[PDB]
Amino acid sequence: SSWWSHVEMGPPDPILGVTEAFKRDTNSKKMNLGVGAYRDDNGKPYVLNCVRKAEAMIAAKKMDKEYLPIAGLADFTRASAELALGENSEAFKSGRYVTVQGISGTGSLRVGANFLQRFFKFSRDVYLPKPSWGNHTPIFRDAGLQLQAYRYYDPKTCSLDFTGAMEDISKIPEKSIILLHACAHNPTGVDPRQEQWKELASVVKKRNLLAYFDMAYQGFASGDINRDAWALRHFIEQGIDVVLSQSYAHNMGLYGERAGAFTVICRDAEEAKRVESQLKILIRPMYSNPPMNGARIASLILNTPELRKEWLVEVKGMADRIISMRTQLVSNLKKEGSSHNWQHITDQIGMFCFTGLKPEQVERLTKEFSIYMTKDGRISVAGVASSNVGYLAHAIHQVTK
Amino acid sequence: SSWWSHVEMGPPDPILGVTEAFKRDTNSKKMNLGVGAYRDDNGKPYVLNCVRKAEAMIAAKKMDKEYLPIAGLADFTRASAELALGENSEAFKSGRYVTVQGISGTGSLRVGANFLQRFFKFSRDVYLPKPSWGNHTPIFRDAGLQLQAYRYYDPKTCSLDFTGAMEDISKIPEKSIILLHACAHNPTGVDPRQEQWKELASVVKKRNLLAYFDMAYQGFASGDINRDAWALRHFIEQGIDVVLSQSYAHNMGLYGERAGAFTVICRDAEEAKRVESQLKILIRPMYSNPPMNGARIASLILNTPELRKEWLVEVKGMADRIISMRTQLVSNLKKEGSSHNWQHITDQIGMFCFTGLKPEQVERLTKEFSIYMTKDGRISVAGVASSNVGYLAHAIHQVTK
Ligand SMILES: Cc1ncc(COP(=O)(O)O)c(CN[C@@H](CC(=O)O)C(=O)O)c1O
Ligand SMILES: Cc1ncc(COP(=O)(O)O)c(CN[C@@H](CC(=O)O)C(=O)O)c1O
């Protein structure tokens, strides 16, 4: 008996673990449809054009590698707030916000949760949608808060249970915390309608709840970044001071570089200055200062007019491709002779499809076809190419037939 | 009264805050001797030659930016363990270790502390040397452990209080946790002698204490990396299963890229496999997966023979330069006419000098000469160039005169 004789074998991550299992298969037709990672039409990792050029400017410039302030690159930080808020926004304009570079979306989310654990004195409860991204639970749980839930998806109907959502939300206790996905809800791919959003705003406002927005997919819901930030902006303009986490992993394909941010909307710039100070104190003993490569690339794209415009064409091109794969999948299914209604596939937005396959079917897909996906029936359509869409549809059909 | 009306203005970081204050001064002769960051002889940020070439290979290769496993780049991870352990080591050879990429030294340290908080069932007390790096306190405190102390430095004598250290250590309760700096203790620049180390080993072994080693400066104590890893290796070969955190921020000048690692020495490779699994579960909800740029550069240097050999010449050159600045400082002091004994300056090793100036003198230095240093009298000699060593010595002299 040594120090760790009692430490048990823990299980593999429900999402991340999918790539580990995928890595090992020798089937040359294998497809990794687990994690949400964009693939180009050859079904290959895609580094955006603007990223490649950003990198080149960085090189050419022969920049140092000195430590960044605890809060991140100022240019990156100011530019992210602006991307979420919009440049004409009163909040942005008045400087009633504090944005801090974070370790991608996950990193930002945990900085937020930790912040909240420490300073949100009105409650310990965070309300998550049913269902929500698997990692939201443990993020809030490790930070020290309690998890609760509100109704959201209706599997019978493959859409939003708006009556249920509103019931639950109208009953959450005042001053509690509610988490909302800004756009391209994960994993359902179903977002509230503008009108629907207008109504949630009212109830949140009315019950005096802290709204925590998770904005991991800005530009993937419609293909337009301002349009994808609507609800978030609408909330702030209604007088709701939200907290928000942003990720650049998918919309800029910076996955492993880990670039993201966490923002707090405050009452004044003076308030923002004191929040900033406490966020630095929290981050110092966590990881000291954040990773520079992803933030330098992102800042350069966002702040360089030609790079930004190129970026936006690129985000549009990515979203479009996802659409075409959705379309073709459905068509292939009909073509294979599938009886089922696959309309939800083309109805859903974002990088995935919440298919509805049962765990026995998910299991067969992996073992007979070497198609890896999460156990809840979620598949990343973003990772399908023109060359294997046929393979996918045949498989889905066989296991469903 | 809004959400954060009660959040107070927190103070600036005792080290990191020095660079913020330094940034603002308009004095063209200002010197930032706060944080430990190497400067070349022109007093400029220095990106190693091998780093520059590593970067170039990476570019040329047109690598993707896909997410890395939760534990890091395998090549980086295997190579770090090896750099600390030595290639002939039984521990390394037998695979009785688990190494996980971490967010530099700070990141690794917190992963460790968090791990310990969760799995070290024999105690909540971490013993720190007096004095220790300021950030060790809050790292352990935020993770949820209790801090204790053992005697270490003797200001009267400007050296190690070995009798005191041993007294205190011989009385720490069995199965408690003790933190030791592998080499170039921060901030004293005084390390135990080999013989001294031999004696600490015995007492740690005897009281069955968990030894936690902080190895932030491998190659800066002597200019030789194997020699700097001696004590750490000696402990493991005596049968002590330590835990350790490594940083590549200074020895590879990867500061802002944040490359580091956390290792656990276990009884078997099977044990290592279960520890690994729990470390992944801890990291997933923290930052998901780590930053790739620093780890790719480091892996390439460590695993490419010519790059490694170049690296070692470079580490030696850096250490040598620090020595020459130490020498010249002392000489300048005599030359200026200083009565005091400045021998500790040349006696200390690593990037700093624990000068002994009082806070009123530190204050004057900043206001009259614009020389920034921490309030405990610690100065980074590593940041002195041939051109301002004279300025420094004159200043020190004026304020000491
Ligand atoms: C809703 C949501 N929020 C935050 C994140 C955080 O992303 P990063 O930390 O990588 O910036 C993701 C990524 N969800 C992906 C990836 C994953 O789980 O790692 C998914 O497969 O659902 C996400 O879907
Ligand atoms: C003893 C010690 N351990 C760990 C670290 C962690 O370094 P990174 O997180 O940057 O890898 C440092 C850096 N101490 C420096 C830098 C600092 O405080 O940020 C110092 O000025 O003491 C250190 O001195």
Swiss-Prot record, chains A, B:
**GO process annotations (BP):** 2-oxoglutarate metabolic process; aspartate catabolic process; aspartate metabolic process; biosynthetic process; glutamate metabolic process
What PROSITE patterns does this protein's entry cite?
AA_TRANSFER_CLASS_1
Residues bound to substrate: G36, W133, N186, R378
**Which reactions is this enzyme annotated as catalysing?**
L-aspartate + 2-oxoglutarate = oxaloacetate + L-glutamate; L-kynurenine + 2-oxoglutarate = kynurenate + L-glutamate + H2O
Q: Which cofactors does it use?
A: pyridoxal 5'-phosphate
Q: Principal place where this protein is found?
A: mitochondrion
**Misc. comment:** In eukaryotes there are cytoplasmic, mitochondrial and chloroplastic isozymes.
Q: What is stated as this protein's family in its record?
A: Belongs to the class-I pyridoxal-phosphate-dependent aminotransferase family.
Oligomeric and partner information: Homodimer.
Protein name as it appears in the record: Aspartate aminotransferase, mitochondrial
**Whose protein is this, by species?**
Gallus gallus (Chicken)
Q: List the gene name.
A: GOT2
